[PDB]
Amino acid sequence: PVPNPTMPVKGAGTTLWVYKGSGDPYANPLSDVDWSRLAKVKDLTPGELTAESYDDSYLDDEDADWTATGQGQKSAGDTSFTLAWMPGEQGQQALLAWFNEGDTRAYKIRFPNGTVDVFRGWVSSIGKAVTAKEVITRTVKVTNVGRPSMAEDRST
Amino acid sequence: PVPNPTMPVKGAGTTLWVYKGSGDPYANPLSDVDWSRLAKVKDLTPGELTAESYDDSYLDDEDADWTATGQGQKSAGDTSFTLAWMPGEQGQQALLAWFNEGDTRAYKIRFPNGTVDVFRGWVSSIGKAVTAKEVITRTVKVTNVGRPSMAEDRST
């Protein structure tokens, strides 16, 4: 009802997709052609962008009472999510093949306000939890490579 | 005289039905085809629709003198009723099968003014009361799921 990217949104209805194309995943992320959904998402934690610190001090500085630093190398973090375990689904088979082969692939997060986030990465963890009274869950962690394509890139 | 939904009604003559068909229960609740009646009702407490609160406060709000909230998630509550205990009736056998299976089915309440309320739920309690001087009773509670179909939806 309110797909407004200038106002807060509650985030119910967020979807995860994985690329299966030979083109550029960053060129047109709003299109759902050649993307496959990962359904039944129970929990999602997107990667955090961070940067290291670089020392800017010299012996000749007239002011040395306070530290001075600069921005260093940047990182894209790890994305971690939980699905319902369904080995018969094609998406989870493709996820397991992605872990086994060791490729760096592109994936999307789509938010209810109408914006997408695109990352590239490789899988670094695959887990499971078994409890008598709860549905069995599949846990995934992806390490991101390079510069992502945030929503604010397409704000215009 | 003629039932009138724009005037108060006394409520003597209210009936309770459970769906057996395979179509849409919400499409035409005014028809009794594919519904089974639960006769000999003694008490009926319909489900209560409730909503929870969502906090809408920020640190940069100029005026924190008064609280500010909004409507959160909605619920349909539980519906309770009491019947004369007749284990040989097909309706009560179907009710016990509904409890044992554990699925979600549709049930309607039909009012003396010509209107109907439709809910979907699962049975969460089955009881009995035994007294020497009073007819043995069967007590049932149903937990409702989703958005019901109130009479005001069909007021057109």
Swiss-Prot record, chains A, B:
Transmembrane annotation, as ranges: none
Main location: virion
Localisation per UniProt entry: Virion; Host cytoplasm
Keywords, sorted A to Z: Host cytoplasm, Viral genome ejection through host cell envelope, Viral long flexible tail ejection system, Viral penetration into host cytoplasm, Viral release from host cell, Viral tail assembly, Viral tail protein, Viral tail tube protein, Virion, Virus entry into host cell
GO cellular component, as recorded: host cell cytoplasm; virus tail, tube
Record flagged with keyword Plastid: no
Alphabetical GO biological process terms: symbiont genome ejection through host cell envelope, long flexible tail mechanism; viral tail assembly
The protein's assembly and partners: Multimerizes into a structure formed by 32 hexameric rings stacked on phage baseplate gpM and gpL. Does not multimerize in solution without the tail initiation complex. Soluble major tail protein interacts with tail assembly protein GT during tail assembly.
Function: Forms the phage's tail tube composed of 32 hexameric disks. When it encounters the appropriate initiation complex gpM and gpL, it assembles in hexameric rings that stack on top of each others. Multimerization ceases when the correct tail length is achieved through a mechanism dependent on tail terminator protein.
Name of the protein in question: Tail tube protein
